[PDB]
Design an enzyme around this catalytic site. Structure first.
Site, PDB file in Angstrom:
ATOM      1  N   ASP A  30       0.832  -1.214   0.000  1.00 43.61           N
ATOM      2  CA  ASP A  30       0.000   0.000   0.000  1.00 43.61           C
ATOM      3  C   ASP A  30       0.861   1.257   0.000  1.00 43.61           C
ATOM      4  O   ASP A  30       0.641   2.220   0.750  1.00 43.61           O
ATOM      5  CB  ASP A  30      -1.054  -0.003   1.112  1.00 43.61           C
ATOM      6  N   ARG A  82      -0.327   9.079   0.976  1.00 46.25           N
ATOM      7  CA  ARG A  82      -1.066   9.095   2.249  1.00 46.25           C
ATOM      8  C   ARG A  82      -0.420   8.196   3.309  1.00 46.25           C
ATOM      9  O   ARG A  82      -0.754   8.335   4.481  1.00 46.25           O
ATOM     10  CB  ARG A  82      -2.531   8.664   2.029  1.00 46.25           C
ATOM     11  N   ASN A  83       0.458   7.236   2.885  1.00 48.37           N
ATOM     12  CA  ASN A  83       1.049   6.241   3.785  1.00 48.37           C
ATOM     13  C   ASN A  83       2.508   6.523   4.122  1.00 48.37           C
ATOM     14  O   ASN A  83       3.205   5.648   4.676  1.00 48.37           O
ATOM     15  CB  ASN A  83       0.845   4.827   3.229  1.00 48.37           C
ATOM     16  N   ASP A 139       2.794   2.865   7.544  1.00 48.24           N
ATOM     17  CA  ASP A 139       1.706   1.955   7.161  1.00 48.24           C
ATOM     18  C   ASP A 139       2.184   0.517   6.884  1.00 48.24           C
ATOM     19  O   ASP A 139       1.798  -0.091   5.884  1.00 48.24           O
ATOM     20  CB  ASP A 139       0.934   2.512   5.953  1.00 48.24           C
TER      21      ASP A 139
HETATM   22  C1  LIG Z   1      -2.691  12.121   5.379  1.00 49.75           C
HETATM   23  C2  LIG Z   1      -3.357  11.904   4.024  1.00 49.75           C
HETATM   24  C3  LIG Z   1      -3.332  11.713   6.460  1.00 49.75           C
HETATM   25  C4  LIG Z   1      -2.830  11.885   7.890  1.00 49.75           C
HETATM   26  O1  LIG Z   1      -1.938  12.624   8.174  1.00 49.75           O
HETATM   27  N1  LIG Z   1      -3.494  11.103   8.907  1.00 49.75           N
HETATM   28  C5  LIG Z   1      -3.177  11.209  10.325  1.00 49.75           C
HETATM   29  C6  LIG Z   1      -4.291  10.546  11.147  1.00 49.75           C
HETATM   30  C7  LIG Z   1      -4.001  10.671  12.650  1.00 49.75           C
HETATM   31  C8  LIG Z   1      -2.613  10.118  12.998  1.00 49.75           C
HETATM   32  N2  LIG Z   1      -1.602  10.693  12.108  1.00 49.75           N
HETATM   33  C9  LIG Z   1      -0.218  10.700  12.544  1.00 49.75           C
HETATM   34  C10 LIG Z   1       0.422   9.485  12.821  1.00 49.75           C
HETATM   35  F1  LIG Z   1      -0.245   8.306  12.698  1.00 49.75           F
HETATM   36  C11 LIG Z   1       1.741   9.388  13.234  1.00 49.75           C
HETATM   37  C12 LIG Z   1       2.474  10.556  13.338  1.00 49.75           C
HETATM   38  C13 LIG Z   1       3.942  10.531  13.770  1.00 49.75           C
HETATM   39  N3  LIG Z   1       4.684   9.291  13.693  1.00 49.75           N
HETATM   40  O2  LIG Z   1       4.461  11.539  14.149  1.00 49.75           O
HETATM   41  C14 LIG Z   1       1.866  11.771  13.048  1.00 49.75           C
HETATM   42  N4  LIG Z   1       2.399  13.055  13.044  1.00 49.75           N
HETATM   43  C15 LIG Z   1       1.429  13.908  12.734  1.00 49.75           C
HETATM   44  C16 LIG Z   1       1.671  15.417  12.711  1.00 49.75           C
HETATM   45  C17 LIG Z   1       0.352  13.212  12.447  1.00 49.75           C
HETATM   46  C18 LIG Z   1      -0.973  13.877  12.007  1.00 49.75           C
HETATM   47  C19 LIG Z   1       0.508  11.902  12.612  1.00 49.75           C
HETATM   48  C20 LIG Z   1      -1.818  10.600  10.674  1.00 49.75           C
END
Ligand SMILES: */C(C)=C\C(=O)N[C@H]1CCCN(c2c(F)cc(C(N)=O)c3[nH]c(C)c(C)c23)C1
Length: 260
Positions: A123, A127-128, A141
């Site tokens: 995937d 977005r990942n 991911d």
């Molecule tokens: C992009 C298309 C989507 C997106 O950013 N989704 C978010 C959803 C909530 C959790 N998010 C997330 C994460 F899973 C991990 C980290 C990290 N390792 O720092 C993270 N940093 C930020 C600023 C976010 C929003 C993060 C992904």
């Protein structure tokens, strides 16, 4: 147990909420009072093994897990700029093409490492991937980290399939291979050079699968030189065996960086 991987939750602080989704809440915090971390609170063994055995500068790194209590915590490296897709769509960054090529190389290095370990991501998409405070792109991911970023493919029980990042043999026959990750990588290069446009943006998933079958390919984004376009296009050979490896793609990317 997980040995050195089991984190004491008494060593974690919670500073800011990053997101709320299907698999739980993600918070930014500190670990041992000095390390910036992302803490996922799950609303496992197999997905944990995946992250405990893969490590690379361009993969989002697992620091540990909290499993001696409920709900479970997953602790990873902190990526301040969130997902690559939203980072690309933020027009205030006014990226130079040199920056866009560096994002491609970051992901290609992660994928070359994964391919050397015989690990298939399945995937790969903007977005990942996540982006740190220095603008470094890292692939996420995979294993436990699928649940961290509330992956729609995982949360939809496989209903939301990444059609637009899939080669014809996946769409027709479910033929997954190193060469379906290569195809997805070329689509990711196209997402980067298009500043985060949806691939095949005016088609539905059904129409995209039909057009792919007919030989449709993504056009050259205006930001991509002909040499950069050749690299992404090489990922989309109808014959999977004619597509390059990640080691070959990396060498192509470095050659362009040296030439431009
Ligand atoms: C992009 C298309 C989507 C997106 O950013 N989704 C978010 C959803 C909530 C959790 N998010 C997330 C994460 F899973 C991990 C980290 C990290 N390792 O720092 C993270 N940093 C930020 C600023 C976010 C929003 C993060 C992904």
């Amino acid at each position: 147990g997980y040995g050195s991987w089991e984190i004491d939750p008494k060593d974690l602080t919670f500073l800011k909420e990053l997101g709320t989704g299907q698999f739980g809440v993600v918070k930014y915090g500190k670990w041992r009072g000095q390390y910036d971390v992302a803490i996922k609170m799950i609303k496992f063994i197999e997905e944990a093994k995946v992250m405990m055995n893969l490590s690379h500068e361009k993969l989002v790194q697992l620091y540990g897990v909290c499993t001696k209590q409920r709900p479970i915590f997953i602790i990873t490296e902190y990526m301040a700029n969130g997902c690559l897709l939203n980072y690309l769509r933020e027009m205030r960054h006014r990226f130079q093409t040199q920056q866009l090529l560096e994002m491609c190389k970051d992901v290609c290095e992660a994928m070359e490492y994964l391919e050397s370990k015989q690990f298939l991501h399945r995937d790969l998409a903007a977005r990942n991937c996540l982006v740190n405070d220095q603008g470094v792109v890292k692939v996420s991911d995979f294993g436990l980290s699928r649940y961290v970023l509330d992956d729609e493919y995982t949360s939809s029980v496989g209903s939301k399939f990444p059609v637009r990042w899939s080669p014809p043999e996946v769409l027709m026959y479910s033929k997954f291979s190193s060469k379906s990750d290569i195809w997805a990588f070329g689509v990711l290069m196209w997402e980067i050079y298009s500043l985060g446009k949806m691939p095949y943006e005016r088609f539905t998933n059904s129409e995209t699968a039909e057009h792919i079958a007919q030989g449709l390919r993504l056009y050259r984004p205006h930001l991509a030189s002909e040499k950069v376009y050749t690299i992404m296009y090489s990922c989309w050979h109808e014959k999977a065996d004619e597509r390059p490896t990640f080691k070959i793609l990396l060498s192509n990317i470095l050659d362009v960086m040296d030439e431009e």
